C-alpha cells in the first residue's frame, strides 16, 4: 500500500548491487604506507604540543589533556583522535616494557 509521506517513503524500486566506485577507498592505510609513517615517527619524533600532552596524559588527567588538544589541533573530532593515539604510544611505552 505504497505512499509518499511517512516512514517507508517513495516509489518502490529494487536496489542494484554493485562493487563501489574506486574513489571511495581513498584514505585506507595500505600497509606499505603504514610502514612509511611508522618508521618515520621514530627518526623524527613528536611535536612540542604532543610531548606536553603525553606528560599530562600519564599523570595529570584526561579531561584537561583533551582540553589542551581541543585548542591546538582544531576540532573535537580531531582532538579525541589525537588523544587516543598519544595514549597508544603511552601504552606501548610503558605496558610494553
Amino acid at each position: 500500500y505504497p505512499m509518499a509521506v511517512g516512514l517507508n517513503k517513495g516509489h518502490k524500486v529494487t536496489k542494484n548491487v554493485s562493487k563501489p566506485r574506486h574513489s571511495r577507498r581513498r584514505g585506507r592505510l595500505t600497509k606499505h604506507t603504514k610502514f612509511v609513517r611508522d618508521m618515520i615517527r621514530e627518526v623524527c619524533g613528536f611535536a612540542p604540543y604532543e610531548r606536553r600532552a603525553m606528560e599530562l596524559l600519564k599523570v595529570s588527567k584526561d579531561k584537561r589533556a583533551l582540553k589542551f588538544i581541543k585548542k591546538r589541533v582544531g576540532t573535537h573530532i580531531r582532538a579525541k583522535r589525537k588523544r587516543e593515539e598519544l595514549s597508544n604510544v603511552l601504552a606501548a611505552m610503558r605496558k610494553a616494557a
Binding site: 500500500y1 505504497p2 505512499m3 509518499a4 509521506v5 517513503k9 517513495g10 516509489h11 518502490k12
Partner: protein, 147 residues
C-alpha cells in the same frame, strides 16, 4: 502615438498642466518610499497595513520543489479523462469503474468540491483530504494512494 496624447493638446498653456502656485519641480515629497513612517505614514497605513516589521520564522534556502503539490478538486476530476470514458462507465453491465490518476495529469492532491457524479471511480492520487475521499466513498468509488 505621440499624436493621441495630452502634451499636444496642452501646448500653448503656460504651466503645462501643473499649476501656477504648486509649480511642479523635481521631488517635493522625497524619492521613492521616503518618509514612509514619518510624513507618508497615513498613506502606508489605510493602504498597506502590515508593511513594517518581523512576522515569522526565517527559513534559509527554501526549495520550491519540496513543497510542490498541485491540487484538483472533484468537479475538475472527470475532465482528466475523456468524456468517452464516463459515458461508457455507467451503461449497465457491472461495477467496472475507470481509473483517474491525477499524477499523469500533473496534480498531486485531491481536494473536495461537491457534485461528484453517481458513477464509481478508482482515483490514484498522492494525497487526499477527508472531505474528498468520503465523497468518493459515497458514490461507490475507491481511494487508492500512490507514491
Amino acid at each position: 502615438p505621440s499624436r493621441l496624447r495630452k502634451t499636444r493638446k496642452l501646448r500653448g498653456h503656460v504651466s503645462h498642466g501643473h499649476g501656477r502656485i504648486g509649480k511642479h519641480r523635481k521631488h517635493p515629497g522625497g524619492r521613492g518610499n521616503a518618509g514612509g513612517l514619518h510624513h507618508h505614514r497615513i498613506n502606508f497605513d489605510k493602504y498597506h497595513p502590515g508593511y513594517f516589521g518581523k512576522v515569522g520564522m526565517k527559513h534559509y534556502h527554501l526549495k520550491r520543489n519540496q513543497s510542490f503539490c498541485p491540487t484538483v478538486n472533484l468537479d475538475k476530476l472527470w475532465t482528466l479523462v475523456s468524456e468517452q470514458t464516463r459515458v461508457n462507465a455507467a451503461k449497465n453491465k457491472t461495477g467496472a469503474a475507470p481509473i483517474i490518476d491525477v499524477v499523469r495529469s500533473g496534480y498531486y492532491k485531491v481536494l473536495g468540491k461537491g457534485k461528484l457524479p453517481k458513477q464509481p471511480v478508482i482515483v490514484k492520487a498522492k494525497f487526499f483530504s477527508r472531505r474528498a475521499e468520503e465523497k468518493i466513498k459515497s458514490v461507490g468509488g475507491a481511494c487508492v494512494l500512490v507514491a
